[PDB]
């Protein structure tokens, strides 16, 4: 089913982001953002590549298939031949169309799941000092620079370095 | 060769005693036999990803 | 899609747990844990058993299929016969392989969903007095013994018994 | 997989609700509830209608199929004819039953996903002033009338109108 991220609680995509599928957008003391997340997008590329190659290699190529000939006293066999060809053609066209239609919902839900998990990870490693504000943004009670940005990105945040100082600012706003 | 056991399925390579739905031996069967396919492995998962701890 | 629990926010599995698929690990005043959750694992066993039996009973057994013979002036019918046999064989081998490949993602996502729901239940019946700490662990501001352990397990926690006392300890740490 | 809402953290359905699939139940100063959510249920109706029409239009109708006749020296061709008819019949009955069995889990999980997303939206636009109490209910520290009910329903809540006053009542209960 729909996991709720793409065109969900997160609004439309980012045109300005180029080198990936899933990324961040940061505004510390000296810049704006648009950096991609090269870890998760590589797993997505691997999954999709394996999927397409699997769908290609399940379908065998056909060899030579040439029509046959019958005279006017072999109408019965000729109708049988036509029945066999039309039956197999209907079966294969059904299989092809149905396979593509199901595979498309599978892949769109796969991307949706990736975005939701990439959001939950960032939320989980910023437990207290964040104050999420809407459509997947956070806001750092403490002060952050480029190093803590990369520290968030990699997945190594070390929360107890900042845990006291944030607390002060939180009690300032409350 | 011919021996004198008792089966419910027979191929020209020998007999079969199974209840699985698919079959891989030979396509010419006598009796009531599982369906012949042209594959090598149809293992089916009933369980979790085996993720050992570190 | 991937629900995010198995090899996700929860790390690798437990070798020491034996009698089930989903369980707990508790450390009260007088012991360590590894008890299974016999309610949810039974539903998983029922679902998987019905799935395998359904996949078995959709495939009909075949009866006797013996080759035929033709002389040198019936080449045309002989080629038709070979075409019919090869066509049906290709159709069935396609159906078998494709059915197994889709069923495998279905079952792995089923287990992943079960783990996520079993986590959300425990979180929901420990609303205030828990302080979750990471990879699916909680930590009881109040004091717990074996009876409140089973009280959590069954799904009968009665939160207002402890709600005041926990509060005291919470304000001690803050 | 199972998203956890229907027969999950939310209990059984509402018989008293008529004009939709997903709705609300409100108890402000002058009434009780049961109003439907006409936005999401319309998307569900569109999806399901397109699904059923797609499944209908993939299956082609058959034209005239009349049995044939053979004498006592054409047993070989007669057995070939019977083999062709039985093979195609088995293939189509397999495809029909398997398509219905997979489509049913797809549609039930679709409804489950819709209920979970409709819950997450209401939670997200009532960040601080709600105090959720169980099986998908909220409880408004501030005071609400019919206008803020519709304000929640449409998706236009304007939280900073009430954000201070709620805060007062919250500190009353704490
Ligand atoms: C993920 O991000 C962390 C940053 O938190 C990376 O660790 C960092 O590695 C860089 C390398 O440029 C360090 O910067 C420089 O280190 C050298 C050597 O000590 C120093 O001379 C420079 O002045 C500068 O500090 C950075 O300090 C270090 N992290 C820390 C503790 O700040 C990490 O490599 C990235 N990758 C992973 C998977 O962690
Ligand atoms: C789920 O767990 C609860 C525990 O919260 C189970 O209820 C408990 O049943 C046990 C039976 O051993 C009670 O323990 C003993 O009860 C006897 C009879 O009163 C008493 O003489 C013993 O001294 C001891 O208390 C236990 O007290 C009771 N729960 C309470 C209120 O503590 C329950 O049966 C388990 N199953 C379900 C589905 O609830
Ligand atoms: C979603 O709900 C909002 C309510 O928050 C709707 O906006 C509201 O439109 C109604 C129309 O009946 C307003 O009620 C009346 O407006 C007239 C004209 O100003 C006034 O004379 C009446 O005394 C009464 O106020 C209502 O005031 C207005 N919302 C506000 C600001 O209270 C909205 O149309 C609904 N639809 C959407 C998609 O927003
Ligand atoms: C086919 O194999 C099955 C399973 O091995 C046999 O069934 C059981 O075999 C064991 C070992 O010989 C016996 O102890 C059981 O009593 C058998 N169970 C049944 C079904 O009664 C089965 O006998 C084999 N059939 C043949 C003819 O070899």
UniProtKB/Swiss-Prot annotation, chains A, C, D:
Cystine residue pairs: 144-148
From-to range in the entire protein, with total length: 345 to 518 of 566
List of glycosylated residues: 154
Annotated protein name in UniProt: Hemagglutinin HA2 chain
Species, as recorded: Influenza A virus (strain A/Duck/Alberta/35/1976 H1N1)
């Amino acid at each position: 089913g729909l996991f709720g991220a793409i065109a969900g609680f997160i609004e439309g995509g980012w045109t300005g982001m180029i080198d990936g599928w899933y990324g961040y957008h940061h505004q510390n003391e000296q810049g704006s953002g648009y950096a991609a997340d090269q870890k998760s997008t590589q797993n997505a590329i691997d999954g999709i590549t394996s999927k397409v190659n699997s769908v290609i290699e399940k379908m065998n190529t056909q060899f030579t298939a040439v029509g046959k000939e019958f005279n006017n006293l072999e109408r019965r066999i000729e109708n049988l031949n036509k029945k066999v060809d039309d039956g197999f053609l209907d079966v294969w066209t059904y299989n092809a169309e149905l396979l593509v239609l199901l595979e498309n919902e599978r892949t769109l839900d796969f991307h949706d799941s990736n975005v939701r998990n990439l959001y939950e990870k960032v939320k989980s490693q910023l437990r207290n000092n964040a104050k999420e504000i809407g459509n997947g943004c956070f806001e750092f009670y403490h002060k952050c620079d480029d190093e803590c940005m990369e520290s968030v990105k990699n997945g190594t945040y070390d929360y107890p370095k900042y845990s006291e100082e944030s607390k002060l600012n939180r009690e300032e706003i409350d | 060769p011919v021996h004198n056991c008792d089966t419910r399925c027979q191929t020209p390579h020998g007999a079969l005693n199974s209840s699985l739905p698919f079959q891989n031996v030979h396509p010419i069967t006598i009796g009531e036999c599982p369906k012949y396919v042209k594959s090598t492995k149809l293992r089916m998962a009933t369980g979790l990803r085996n993720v050992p701890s570190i």
